[PDB]
Structure formats: C-alpha cells, structure tokens
Amino acid sequence: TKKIVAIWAQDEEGVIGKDNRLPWYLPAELQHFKETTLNHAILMGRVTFDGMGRRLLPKRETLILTRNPEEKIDGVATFHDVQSVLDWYSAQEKNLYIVGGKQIFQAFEPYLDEVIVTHIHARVEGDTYFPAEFDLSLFETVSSKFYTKDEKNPYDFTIQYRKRKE
C-alpha cells in the first residue's frame, strides 16, 4: 500500500520553473495536487519551499530537504540527505510524495514507485526543466484525465498516473 510517488507539472517542452516559482497559474491543477497529497507527507527542496513563500499546506506533513544545518522552520521537519528521508519513510505508513525542485526529483528517482505527471498544453519560458536524464520508460500509464481550459485555467492540461513497470 505504501509508496513513494513523484508528482510534478510541466509544459510541452519540460519546463517546470522560472525565478523560483512556476511559470503559470492553474488553480484547477493545484486542486489536483491538494487532493492527491492531502493527509500524506510531501518532500520538497528548500528552494521550492522558499519559492512558495514558505507556506505550510494544511493537512500535509511537510518535509524539507536542505544541506543547511541551521535551517529550522516551525511546522515542518528538516532533512539533510536522502538516506535520512528513506529511513523516515520506512518508519511510517503514509505514502510519501516527492513534490519538487528539479534537484529533489533527481535525487529521488531511484526510489520512485510511481509518478503523477501533469502535461500542460502550452509553451512558456522557464529556466528550470524536469530532469531530461530521468528515465520515464521504466513507468507505464495506468490512468489519465483531460482537463479543458476555462476562465480561471487558461491552458488545457492532462494528468497521467504511471506505475513502475515490473
């Protein structure tokens, strides 16, 4: 039942970030993020955390990965290496969602059970892309859904759930 899942959103070319934030705004996609991670743990890099104004998502067990030994935010648990997070994960039952920052996605690739990827049907300008060396072939699409754009969500997008091929 328990698993480590990577979840991210990207444009048509793999863009995931710009100026420490996301180069788009789609409340409906954020809603999907909320429903998926609700009542679970999420691990994000220190940069992405600061990028979102250090906001603590309600009903989410927030885990921050940093190399700063003096880093200490109230409301969140700090981790300084991958092994530490894996030990934490094994000592509990909740699913663990790798939520972001290209470096974090790269660091956890070997331990991923599944990926939930949102393909935004648009092309934007970004300075950070999903890891091009990430081997998505080891995964298989189990389900997906198309979300039609509207006033508040200017770009169409699709969400795919892909499990690790046996």
Ligand X SMILES: CN(Cc1cnc2nc(N)nc(N)c2n1)c1ccc(C(=O)N[C@@H](CCC(=O)O)C(=O)O)cc1
66 binds, among ligand X, ligand NDP, a copy of itself, none (CB under 5 to 8 A by kind): ligand NDP
Q: How far is the CB of 63 from a copy of itself (least distance, A)?
A: 18
Of 24, 29, 66, 102, the one binding ligand X (CB under 6 A) is 29
- Residue 46: phi and psi, rounded to 5, are -60, -40
- Name which of residues 42 to 81 contact ligand X (CB under 6 A): 52, 57-58
Q: Which residue has the tokens 């300008």?
A: 125
34 binds, among ligand X, ligand NDP, a copy of itself, none (CB under 5 to 8 A by kind): ligand X
**Is the CB of residue 131 less than 8 Å from the CB of residue 39?**
no
Of 9, 15, 65, 120, the one binding ligand X (CB under 6 A) is 9
Distance in angstroms (rounded) separating the CA atoms of residues 82 and 141: 27
**Is the CB of residue 53 less than 8 Å from the CB of residue 72?**
no
Does residue 37 interact with ligand NDP by CB under 6 A?
no
For 59, counting Cβ atoms within 10 Å of its Cβ (0-12 exposed, 13-18 middle, 19+ buried), the class is exposed
Q: Which residue has the tokens 């600061």?
A: 50
Nearer to a copy of itself, 5 or 104 (CB): 104
Nearer to a copy of itself, 20 or 158 (CB): 20
Binding string, 105-144, against ligand X, x = CB under 6 A?
-------------x--------------------------
Distance in angstroms (rounded) separating the CA atoms of residues 11 and 91: 36
Binding string, 71-100, against ligand NDP, x = CB under 6 A?
---------xxx----------------xx
SS3 content of the chain, % helix, strand, coil (to 5): 25, 35, 45
> Which H or E element spans position 65?
strand 61-65
Q: Which residues bind a copy of itself (CB under 8 A)?
A: 19-25, 27, 50-55, 122-125, 151-152, 154-155
